[PDB]
Enzyme design. Sequence first.
Site, mmCIF file in Angstrom:
data_model
loop_
_atom_site.group_PDB
_atom_site.id
_atom_site.type_symbol
_atom_site.label_atom_id
_atom_site.label_comp_id
_atom_site.label_asym_id
_atom_site.label_seq_id
_atom_site.Cartn_x
_atom_site.Cartn_y
_atom_site.Cartn_z
ATOM 1 N N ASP A 35 -94.799 -23.083 -15.148
ATOM 2 C CA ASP A 35 -96.147 -22.763 -14.050
ATOM 3 C C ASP A 35 -96.508 -23.495 -13.224
ATOM 4 O OD1 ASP A 35 -97.977 -21.104 -12.993
ATOM 5 O OD2 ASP A 35 -99.080 -20.586 -14.445
ATOM 6 N N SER A 199 -99.356 -25.192 5.710
ATOM 7 C CA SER A 199 -98.973 -24.601 6.342
ATOM 8 C C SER A 199 -99.150 -24.682 7.514
ATOM 9 C CB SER A 199 -98.136 -23.052 6.257
ATOM 10 O OG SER A 199 -97.451 -22.663 5.910
#
Length: 330
Positions: A35, A199
């Site tokens: 994770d 992004s």
Amino acid sequence: STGSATTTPIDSLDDAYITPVQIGTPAQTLNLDFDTGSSDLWVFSSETTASEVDGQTIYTPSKSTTAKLLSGATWSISYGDGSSSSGDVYTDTVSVGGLTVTGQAVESAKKVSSSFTEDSTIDGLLGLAFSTLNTVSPTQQKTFFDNAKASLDSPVFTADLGYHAPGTYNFGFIDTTAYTGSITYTAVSTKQGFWEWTSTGYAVGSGTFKSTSIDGIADTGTTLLYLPATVVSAYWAQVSGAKSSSSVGGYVFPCSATLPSFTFGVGSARIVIPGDYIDFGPISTGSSSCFGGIQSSAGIGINIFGDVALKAAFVVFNGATTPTLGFASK
């Protein structure tokens, strides 16, 4: 040193991925959920409340000659999906894919929430976010990666998740045969303890690319792709009959649909998520309403590039002094 381990989807939907991890002496192999959005290595154990164990493999520290109680240390964690666990702490030898760390904090669960109990395939979590998020008190502990880093050939790990197929976690090297083209690197902020990056935009299907900054985290422990409501609405508007259902808990679409791809930007590069990766199947057995793999982050407080996005790429988690993230197509 290096390590290399195969990671395997837990079910036919790729809801999560498990990776075998050797703990203790002699080794006890547990299948852990790696994770990158948390920083605790915790396991089902001989200390876990019996009614909360249902099929998991447990770590028994009393059977490990290298286990030592970390006296006074406790831990307690809550995850974004509302699940939780807590307990006490041992140090022991932990190996992943041939890479060994001695003195790793292994957090032994005394209690786990129902979601964990109900998933027989996940024996615990191995956190790979920054150690500043580790919950051990009163002495915070380091992640497996942080402990291994100095010994690694290069201070990196990579995630290469498969779509309905096994993939690989590598530590200490970049497998140049595992991706196509070049890797595009992008800046990371560690201010919130995550692999947080920005992004450069998105496209829906064959549509034009929208240049827009989307801050979010690369999180292997989250199944879906969670993005701003504007972006998510633009995606689902291209699917006839798709709608947001408050009763189901997100966007659903007719199971008869063909889903468009979704592209996200990494610098000037582009990662394409095929439409099929966005299908999470019937909302309930036999239903013709299917659950979408792109969902709104509104009210989460952060955008999450979870498995839906990451499995479309070869992803480098660069833990150099100034961390960065790399993405390549594959």
